[PDB]
Each structure stands twice: as structure tokens, then as C-alpha cells.
Amino acid sequence: RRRQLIRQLLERDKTPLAILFMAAVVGTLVGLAAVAFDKGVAWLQNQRMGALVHTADNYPLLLTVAFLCSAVLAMFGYFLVRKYAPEAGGSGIPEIEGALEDQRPVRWWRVLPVKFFGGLGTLGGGMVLGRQGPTVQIGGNIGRMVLDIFRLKGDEARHTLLATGAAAGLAAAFNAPLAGILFIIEEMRPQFRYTLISIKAVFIGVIMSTIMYRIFNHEVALIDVGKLSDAPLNTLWLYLILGIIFGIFGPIFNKWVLGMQDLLHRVHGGNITKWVLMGGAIGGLCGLLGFVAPATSGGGFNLIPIATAGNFSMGMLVFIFVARVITTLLCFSSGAPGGIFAPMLALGTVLGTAFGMVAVELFPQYHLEAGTFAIAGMGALLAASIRAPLTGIILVLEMTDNYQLILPMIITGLGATLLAQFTGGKPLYSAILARTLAKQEAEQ
Amino acid sequence: RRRQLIRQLLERDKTPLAILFMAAVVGTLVGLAAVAFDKGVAWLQNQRMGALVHTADNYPLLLTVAFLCSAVLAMFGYFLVRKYAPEAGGSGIPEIEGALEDQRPVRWWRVLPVKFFGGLGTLGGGMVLGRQGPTVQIGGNIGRMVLDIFRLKGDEARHTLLATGAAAGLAAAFNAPLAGILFIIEEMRPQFRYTLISIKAVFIGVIMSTIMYRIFNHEVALIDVGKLSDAPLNTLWLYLILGIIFGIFGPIFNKWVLGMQDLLHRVHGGNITKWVLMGGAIGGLCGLLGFVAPATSGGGFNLIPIATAGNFSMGMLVFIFVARVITTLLCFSSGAPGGIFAPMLALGTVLGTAFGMVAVELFPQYHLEAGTFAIAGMGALLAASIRAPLTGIILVLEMTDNYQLILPMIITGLGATLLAQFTGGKPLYSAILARTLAKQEA
Incomplete structure (x- = not known):
């Protein structure tokens, strides 16, 4: 040819x-x-x-x-x-x-x-x-x-x-x-x-x-996180480790959304009335937490600049992660109109920060900033769950302008998407589309 | 399905x-x-x-x-x-x-x-x-x-x-x-x-x-431009124009590289001795320029921070551009092993900086810094001539670190690759692979 x-x-x-x-x-x-x-x-x-x-x-x-x-x-x-x-x-x-x-x-x-x-x-x-x-x-x-x-x-x-x-x-x-x-x-x-x-x-x-x-949004970023520190070559291996962790948690998170999709369907069966009611119940739960524990509810974009800065205790970081895993599954697996990207950035920042925290403690010789590990992990649930590593690394790049972290950002991303594959896990959007085409034919 | x-x-x-x-x-x-x-x-x-x-x-x-x-x-x-x-x-x-x-x-x-x-x-x-x-x-x-x-x-x-x-x-x-x-x-x-x-x-x-x-090169980078200005929205239309200039030039440069590829092949007939003797003349011309006027020779990376920071006159830039259009075709068309990316980058940095200097005078009310156009112009030739504008942009991004210029850099890139298409230019590396598959069946 x-x-x-x-x-x-x-x-x-x-x-x-x-x-x-x-x-x-x-x-x-x-x-x-x-x-x-x-x-x-x-x-x-x-x-x-x-x-x-x-x-x-x-x-x-x-x-x-x-x-x-x-x-x-x-x-x-x-x-x-x-x-x-x-x-x-x-x-x-x-x-x-x-x-x-x-x-x-x-x-x-x-x-x-x-x-x-x-x-x-x-x-x-x-x-x-x-x-x-x-x-x-x-x-x-x-x-x-x-x-x-x-x-x-x-x-x-x-x-x-x-x-x-x-x-x-x-x-x-x-x-x-x-x-x-x-x-x-x-x-x-x-x-x-x-x-x-x-x-x-x-x-x-x-x-x-x-x-x-x-034209309707100049002079204010979605995420201002300022310039963090660099990462030296002897430090990279730590990002790879954080990546591995995301890689096993990736697929595990994917299973929960899918299963919570099923389990929440058994509450309503398909019935518009039960479903709409279950909707306002969830929504009310969120709007409630939006007053009494705001970090557990909302898009997540707010607590990113905070967690990166290191203004959370490790208790807060653990609290927030668990609580937000729960409310993310609830709002997303329910079927409410709305995305999962933005809360997966928050979930990644929190987890990465908590790892930066323990990274700082164990290695004063490295002169770490837990903040660099939050940025590494922001785009990692995007890597280990939806399996679009190249997209998240460039997404995180654009939102946080910290190019000097490109190497650990890639490294954590690859490890996440390599361990997500290796532990038998599928891209979330592709494995949801599939179950949808499988119902569009099962009824035949 | x-x-x-x-x-x-x-x-x-x-x-x-x-x-x-x-x-x-x-x-x-x-x-x-x-x-x-x-x-x-x-x-x-x-x-x-x-x-x-x-x-x-x-x-x-x-x-x-x-x-x-x-x-x-x-x-x-x-x-x-x-x-x-x-x-x-x-x-x-x-x-x-x-x-x-x-x-x-x-x-x-x-x-x-x-x-x-x-x-x-x-x-x-x-x-x-x-x-x-x-x-x-x-x-x-x-x-x-x-x-x-x-x-x-x-x-x-x-x-x-x-x-x-x-x-x-x-x-x-x-x-x-x-x-x-x-x-x-x-x-x-x-x-x-x-x-x-x-x-x-x-x-x-x-x-x-x-x-x-x-492991063998850290703490130092190939290009260090610093941190330049931002680009106001009432300033973007200038970046569309630059891309248009790069878009009509891209193809014209593409003909020449292809054209002179040919004209040099007449000089040596395909004969290993005349060919090698030509290469030494061109090669000798390049080590010669490398002393009398370094900026007309070499990779071109050296003059990049010097062009962006506006440390060249408009004349000196006019010179550098024309001199480097010559020595680039000569080195690259001749057949010499070596890429054309880097010498293009420096062409774009110089074309931009020149455009950036005319803008500063026509529009003092935009508080412009000619450096910004150098950055938007840098990967524009990559966009026009080789037609990989995404790649061009992301490369210049990773080298210059001026992310606030992303919008003008995308605007120039698309303004380039659009006018290159509308004036019938072609992806050079695909134009080259094409002519090479042509001989490979004639």
C-alpha cells in the first residue's frame, strides 16, 4: 500500500x-x-x-x-x-x-x-x-x-x-x-x-x-496553590510508592461506585417516585453536612489549596478522606446529574497530603514539603480509576502551575495506572458505558 | 458491533x-x-x-x-x-x-x-x-x-x-x-x-x-527566559496576527527546504566524494560563522534568552533571521545528520521578538513586553512547517515555563497551522517521507 x-x-x-x-x-x-x-x-x-x-x-x-x-x-x-x-x-x-x-x-x-x-x-x-x-x-x-x-x-x-x-x-x-x-x-x-x-x-x-x-472569569483561579518546592532525584522513589498505593486503591474505588450503583437501584427498582425521593434525601444529607462539616460536602475544590498548604491535622486528613469517599459514592452512584472528576482531585490531594505528612516525618534528610505529594496525588485517582493518566497530569499541571513537579507527577501517575491494570481494574467510564450497552441488549 | x-x-x-x-x-x-x-x-x-x-x-x-x-x-x-x-x-x-x-x-x-x-x-x-x-x-x-x-x-x-x-x-x-x-x-x-x-x-x-x-544535567536547563508578563484579553488579537504571518511563511520555508534539497543534489550528482566535499564547505562555513558572528551559526538556543529579553536591536534581529534562514536550509537540505526543530525554534523566537517590538510602539496603551511574542512565536514555525502545533506548544511550555502565556501560544499556533493549510503548505516530515517513497518505486 x-x-x-x-x-x-x-x-x-x-x-x-x-x-x-x-x-x-x-x-x-x-x-x-x-x-x-x-x-x-x-x-x-x-x-x-x-x-x-x-x-x-x-x-x-x-x-x-x-x-x-x-x-x-x-x-x-x-x-x-x-x-x-x-x-x-x-x-x-x-x-x-x-x-x-x-x-x-x-x-x-x-x-x-x-x-x-x-x-x-x-x-x-x-x-x-x-x-x-x-x-x-x-x-x-x-x-x-x-x-x-x-x-x-x-x-x-x-x-x-x-x-x-x-x-x-x-x-x-x-x-x-x-x-x-x-x-x-x-x-x-x-x-x-x-x-x-x-x-x-x-x-x-x-x-x-x-x-x-x-471574559466572565478573569483575575481568579479555580485553585491557587502557589509555587511549592522542587523534588530532588533521590526523592522520586517516594512518588513511585505513593503511585503504587493509588494503583491498588484505584480499582477498589471503581468497584464501590459500580456496586453502589446496583445497591442503590434496589432501593428504588427504577421507580421515578422512590428515586426522586431518595434523591432529595441524599441532597438534604449533603446540604446538611454543608453546614456542620463542610469539608465532607461540596465539589472539593475548596480544601485543595488548604490540604496542599498543610493546614490540616493528619486526623482531619483521615477524617475527610473516609467521609468524602462515602459521600462521593452516594452522590455519584445514585445517578444524580454531575461529575466525579472534581471530587477525585480532592480525594487525591487529601491522600497525597497525608502521605507527604508521613514522608516528612520519616525523612528529614530529604527536606520534604507534604505539599509536593498532594500535587503528585491530585491527578492520581484520575489515573488509577478512570485510567487517563496523560489527561490528569496535564490537568493538574494547568490548575496548579507547578511544572518543576512534572517528574514526580508523571511517576506517581504511571505507578497508579500500572498498579490499577496489574490488580485487575478497568477504566471507570469504559466499564460504565459497557454495563449500559449490556442492558441495552439484555432486554432482548 | x-x-x-x-x-x-x-x-x-x-x-x-x-x-x-x-x-x-x-x-x-x-x-x-x-x-x-x-x-x-x-x-x-x-x-x-x-x-x-x-x-x-x-x-x-x-x-x-x-x-x-x-x-x-x-x-x-x-x-x-x-x-x-x-x-x-x-x-x-x-x-x-x-x-x-x-x-x-x-x-x-x-x-x-x-x-x-x-x-x-x-x-x-x-x-x-x-x-x-x-x-x-x-x-x-x-x-x-x-x-x-x-x-x-x-x-x-x-x-x-x-x-x-x-x-x-x-x-x-x-x-x-x-x-x-x-x-x-x-x-x-x-x-x-x-x-x-x-x-x-x-x-x-x-x-x-x-x-x-x-542524572547528568540537572540544576541547568537549555532555555531560561524567566517569568514574563501576562496577556490581557484586549491584547490577544495581536497573537492571531502573528500566527497568520507564521502561517503564510511556513509553506514558503517548506518549499525552499524541499527545493534546495534538490538544487544541492545537482552540485554533487549523488557522488560520495563531491557530496562529502560539499559538506566540508558548508561545515567549514559554519565553524567560520561560529567565530565571526556566532548567532548566525550553531543550534540557536543561545540567542533565545537574548531575543526574548529584548537585548537585540530590530536590525540585528532582521540580520539573525535572514542569516539563519540561509544557514538552516544549507545545513539541513544538504543531507547532514541533525534535526530542524531547534533551528526552527530560534527562527520563531526571532520572528516573534521582531513582531513584539513593533507592537510595543504601535500600542503603548497595552503595556506590552516584546518577550511575550517571542514565546508565542517560538513554536509557531513548528506549527506552520511541520504541522504539529500541539507538540510545538507543549514543548515550548515545558522549556520556557510561562504558562500564563498558554492562550497567546495556542492562538499563534492555530493561526499558524490554519494559514499553512489555507495556503497549501504541507507537513514537512510527511512531505519528505512522501518524496522518499516516490523514488522507492521509480
């Missing part, structure tokens, strides 16, 4: 001008959506705080309007999911992945409103889930919606505009352009065959989405 | 431990090889420096030993390639690219010594090329070599190990473990069909390689 290949080599990277322009508008819309979605979740969390202030005197009345305000919003978002769009529950990524394999449809007329408002419920209620799950599926569907509207044919166009929607959706959500594109290239694209996802085009999307999100 | 997919997902990312262990050894070797190659090159550049000391009074005698030390050294490299391994001349990336498409062979018994020692000559003599191309090909062949020795069977094994070796080679030669991984992904892998290159296995090759080279 030497003569075919010469022909192809000379025709490389010539994405059709129509697809390039369309990628641009998909970016621009996904950014604005992501911005709105963001401004919305904040406002509801904020109203919810102004409620506690009006009743800050009667403590049992306080604990009650904390629970109920998160209960109502939870339910309202659960309900929007089972009633108009059941594939818009959960993360949002197994589906956009499914869509790229041509095995799940992009019902953009239903998913845009459902995921957006159903999300504003669970996240704005203060449940332990992140903003990214939402924006990525939302972005994919928006990519689908401009396909249909401008009626563009091709496999390229369908896959491309789908992919640049999800990528631009991860990008705006995290202020992480590189991470978004790498998330397509390493995790989202169809994994067992060739495809025509123009990468130049996914880029144009990401650019515009990131610009838009910046 | 749905039956097949469900079963494939359940069996994703299970790279066989055999391939994973051998990856670890490939990177380790390529690191060392790269460390060695690098220490070699500088050593020879030092002897040429000390040799200029013993004759630092007789000026025309000085110019001669400059020319001659480099002329001889250059010829050794041209000779070692024409005699023992011809596919080891030039950058060597097209060759490894071909190899992954199973259209070129990996003759490691011939290329390791030829590229290593022949590289030592062209580079050590002080020609306008870089250590990178050499380290990538060397790395690929090392990857091929352990495959044979350990008799690993399979297509996944042949494609993966040859790939992790190529990434490890960029990683070490640039101190850029991410750029190395992104390179295989965005460019080097078979671009038009599915392959079983294990990304996790490439990663392992890059860590071990990058660690090896750290």
Missing part, C-alpha cells in the same frame, strides 16, 4: 473549511453555556447561605432549612432526569463516548435543558459532584445541535463537532484548554479503531470556549 | 507486561545514548574553542582553523552516512515515521554508530542543526534493537517499542517528557489507520529516559 500512503501523506491535515468554522461556533456556545451553568450553581449555593442567615438563631430550625433547601433542589434535578432524559443522569461522559462509537444518540432537544437545569439542582444543592460532567455532555450535545441545524454531512463532521463540543466543555469548566484536547485524544475518541476527528478543529473550539469563559 | 464493543471495553488498557518491561529498558538506553551524544557534541565544540586560543593573534590563521576544524568534522559525518547508512542522513524523523507505517526498515546495526558518530561531526563541528532528530532516530533504532535481541513477536510489540524509543529520544534531548509523548501521538504514529501503540508503554520509556538525562 505504498502508493495509497504517498497519496494520503500529501493530503494530511486538510480539514474542510466548513468544519473549521462550525467548530468555532460550537466552542463559543459551549463557553457561554459553561459560564451560565457556572454563574447559576453559584447563585443557588448563595441563596442557600442567605437562608441559613435568616434562621441562624434556632439551631434545629437551621439544620432543617439546610436539609430541605438541598432536598428540593436535588429532587427537582433527579426528577428532570428520569422524566425527560435518563441518559442525562450521572457523569455525562460514558454517553458522549457512546455517541462517538455510534451506539448512543445525542438527544439534544431533551438533554440540553435537562442536564443544565437538573445539574443546577444537584450542584447548586451542594451535592458532592463537579461541574465538568455537566459541561462535557452539554457541550457534546451542543456540538450535535449545530450539526442538525446547519445540516452538515460526513462522518468527520459528526464525530468532530461532537468531540470539539465535549473538549471545549472540559476546557471552559476547568480553565484547562490543553487538558480538554488531551481528554479527547486519550480517552473520549473511539478506542479500538481509526476516526476522522480533526484535531486542528477540536483546537479552534477549545480556544473560543476558553476565551468566552475568560 | 455492539457485541464486540462491550467485550473490547471490558478489555481496554491491558498492555502485556512483556511490552511494558521492555519499554523501561528502551528509555534507559536512549537516555544514556542521548546523554552520551550530547556530551560528545559539546566536547568537540570545546576543542574548537581551545584551538582558537592557541592562534588568537594571527587573525587569518584563526579564520582558517575555524573553517578547517569544522570542515574536517563535517566531512566525517557526510562520509559516515553515504558509506555505511544513507537513511541516517537528515533529520531521521521521516525514516522512523515510515518505519511505523512499515514502509521503511530499521537497520540498527548500521544507524546507531553512523548517526551517533556522524552526528558528532556535523553537530560538534558547529553546523546549524540540533541534537533532537539524531536522538529520535537513534532512539527508534535502540527500540528496534532490543526487540530483535529479546525476540519479541507481534505487531503491537514492533510498533510500540519503536515508538517509545522515538519519544524517549525527544524527551531526553529536550528535557520534555510530555512533548515527547505528544509527538508520537500527534505526528509519529501511523496517521491514517488504527495501530496498537501502547500509550502507557510510551510513557514508561519517557520517564526512564528523562530520569537518565536528569
